[PDB]
Amino acid sequence: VQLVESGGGLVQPGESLRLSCAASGLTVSSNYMSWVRQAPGKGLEWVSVIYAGGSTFYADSVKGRFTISRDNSKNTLYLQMNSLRAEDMAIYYCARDLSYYGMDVWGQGTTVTVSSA
Amino acid sequence: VQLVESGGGLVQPGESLRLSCAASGLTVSSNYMSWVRQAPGKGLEWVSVIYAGGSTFYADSVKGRFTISRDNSKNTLYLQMNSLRAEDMAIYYCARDLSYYGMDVWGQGTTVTVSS
Amino acid sequence: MDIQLTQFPFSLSASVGDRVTITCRASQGISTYLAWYQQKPGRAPKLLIYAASTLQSGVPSRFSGSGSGTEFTLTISSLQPEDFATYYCQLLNSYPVHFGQGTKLEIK
Amino acid sequence: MDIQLTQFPFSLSASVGDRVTITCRASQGISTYLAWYQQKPGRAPKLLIYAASTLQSGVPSRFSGSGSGTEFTLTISSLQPEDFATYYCQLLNSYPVHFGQGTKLEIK
Amino acid sequence: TNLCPFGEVFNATRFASVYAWNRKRISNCVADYSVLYNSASFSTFKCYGVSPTKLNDLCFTNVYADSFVIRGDEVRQIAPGQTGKIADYNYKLPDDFTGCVIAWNSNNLDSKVGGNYNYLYRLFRKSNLKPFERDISTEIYQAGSTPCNGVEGFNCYFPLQSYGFQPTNGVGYQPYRVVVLSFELLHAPATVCGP
Amino acid sequence: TNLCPFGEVFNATRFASVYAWNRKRISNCVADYSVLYNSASFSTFKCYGVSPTKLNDLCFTNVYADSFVIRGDEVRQIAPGQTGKIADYNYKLPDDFTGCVIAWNSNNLDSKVGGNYNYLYRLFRKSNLKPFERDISTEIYQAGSTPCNGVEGFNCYFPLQSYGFQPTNGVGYQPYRVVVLSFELLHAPATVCGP
Secondary structure, eight states, X not given: OEEEEXXXXXXXXTOOEEEEEEEESSOGGGSEEEEEEEOTTSOEEEXXXXXXXXXXXXXXXXXXXXXXXXXXXXXXXXXXXXXXXXXXXXXXXXXXEOTTSOEEEEOOOEEEEEOOO | OEEEEEOOOEEOTTOOEEEEEEEESSOGXXXXXXXXXXXXXXXXXXXXXXXXXXXXXXXXXXXXXXXXXXXXXXXXXXXEEOSOOGGGOEEEXXXXXXXXXXXXXXXXXEXXXXXX | OOOOEEEEOSEEEEOTTOOEEEEEEESSOOTTOEEEEEEOTTSOOEEEEETTTEEOXXXXXXXXXXXXXXXXXXXXXSOOGGGOSEEEEEEOSXXXXXXXXXXXXXXO | OOOOEEEEOSEEEEOXXXXXXXXXXXXXXXXXXXXXXXXXXXXXXXXXXXXXXXXOTTOOTTEEEEEETTEEEEEESSOOGGGOEXXXXXXXXXXXXXXXXXXXEEXX | OOXXXXXXHHSOSSOOBSTTOEEEEEOSEEOOTXXXXXSSSOOEEEEESSOHHHHTTOEESEEEEEEEEEEXXXXXXXXXXXXXXXXXXXXXXXXXXXXXXXXXXOHHHHXXXXXXXXXXXXXXXXXXXXXXXXXXXXXXXXXXXXXXXXXXXXXXXXXXXXXXXXXXXXXXXXXXXXXXXXXXXXXXXXXXXXX | OOBOOHHHHHTOSSOOXXXXXXXXXXXXXBOOTHHHHHTTTOOEEEEESSOGGGGGGOOBSEEEEEEEEEEGGGGGGSSTTOOSHHHHHTOOOOTTOXXXXXXXXXXXXXXXXXXXXXXXXXXXXXXXXXXXXXXXXOOOEEOSSSOOTTOOBTTXXXXXXXXXXXXXXXXXXXXXXXXXXEEEOOSSOOOBOOO
16 A cells, blocks of 8 residues: 655746646545645644545635546546745655545655745 | 626627616725626525625535625625526525625616526 | 525415514524525515514514524514515525525415 | 533653553533544554443554543553654544644653 | 424434435424424524425425434535535535525533534445435445445445534534425425415 | 743733733743643643744743633634734734743633623734734724814724624634743853753
């Protein structure tokens, strides 16, 4: 069972970036799949979830800028991030959420760096 | 003292419409100003407010789709309505909100119709 | 959870000269943050009472409001023909502005 | 309103073999809807406890979780060298997913 | 002139679990909603597709009363156009819903010291319910590609869970009893009128 | 060796109204945030621009402690990037805020049967507060073109209004005591460390 994130990198404020999370050993479309991020030196912050049935939800701080999606034929989760800001700088983890039983499966995350000056 | 709304009319689903509210006897940019609408045979539903200081707020059913704004020089409030649905068919009232003292000044409404 | 307002009776028949009391119940305690509005047919709403019991300037004294917390009432001591209308309550001081869904007074 | 979770101590020094208890406080009663995670620097968090006291499969039995309502604790019986980490609590069964801001456990 | 049996649905000692939501058909009766809004344990009432002010003066082919318990911050999902665990997987109203949703805090009845675990909800489902669809299956939920064959384990989850209401819960986590009144207007004689 | 006087701020009998929020400067002392959590049950404690886990490792030029009373569902406005009546017109945090926001329910101290009305907020203001700006003026607010000359009347409103704090309020409408700790790092020696 593996979750493998990619697509992180260096961005300027205002640019956009698409993260991917490739799963093996669970079915992305059959699960609550979340993104949770961690800013350098800070705590965990939940970002977005997509339900097995397709409903999506977002942290207030990313509403209107981030979109979560999946591709069943690729067993892959995505996070489209637009209008990136300093506060989006973080490591972004993909996680399978069992909701009552917690988030049992995580990838090791992909780093988003937002250049300062 | 009066608020006069305009801009209502027949529209198809998905189309867009801008409502205006011309005020006299109060300064729109100095007030909380709200839109509240009323679908035929139904009750009042608050739509949006803009604060004197410029902050704006929206009902859940119209967020990302409606935009409130004002023009100080014209003493006029606006509501930009995009991607109109049957849920949006209603008379739209402009009102000045005193927030603790209720909404004391109302316009007489402009009607938005959405064809089926 | 937001506050929800519920008004009853939904519709009431009454005669001119009757005393009528209509109710607005809040789903949680809202102190005195309630306003009452009158809407006559074909007209915009008109503010009657705010802060649960203060009459809006110019509103006739046969109207009065009371209550606090979750239970609010509007009373009309002697109903006049122009008083047959739909009444709405409104939560004050909160911008997700919530209204009740109305009480209609009809002639009996 | 939103639940907020608050973790104490913020930082704690302890020795191998010590018994440590760390706490998570909820701003309102959340029954048993609490999970505990362990995180090494730069690594994904690892789920330790869900439903406030059920050990995740494969977690060593020196970890235990207790509590209900607003006060929750995580106890490590006998600290091992690999137990030093930052620990996070998480509100369960709600998608505006809320985390504590962490307890950092260091070697004494 | 027989009044509709509203009390039988609102005064029940125990309510249904939301995933197993109870339906009662109401017909051939006079709908006095005052026996409802004079109930005292009557707290909130929100209608869709019709105004409450018009109800005393309308007739319907049938009225269905669906009842269940959810937690407080889930009540907003019992409305047209909503999403979330309850609307998606447990009880779904149509976008063009005509009817009224009635809810009240039942902490004094439905919570217990140490938890009341009698109320259940569906936590795992592969697709959203259709409006008014009822799913009471307890099939082990297959979260990966490996068939479960009825055995619980990794990627193989029992699909339901308990609320576990405790009296110290914050109000969003306290139990709410809900009754949904669906007003059916078929091409048929109307049997429910409120005068 | 001398502990920072946090007890003066947190544990004081009466708090300021939010429009007239108090500020205490804290410097030249040892900041034990551990004496903060353990005593004076300070329910809610959230930090920005710094992790709580790092606090005992950090030194600052000055700590400012701002305190006031607001409504429970307004505590979310005491944070970076928020809008609304409190953040716009009463107490504004900067986008780049470095500090912690501490809040606790004060219903047992600050609500009165029949209502406590001594806690005020500013309701009317023409423009938003800048971060950490404080406005205690009580000028009659001019809502139209006619100047008020200090006379209350139509379009001429007293700019403050009173919280209604009754013990039967929903928890979002109950009073919350708030302390905001600002961590200032100037180009100067550090005076607050707290090992």
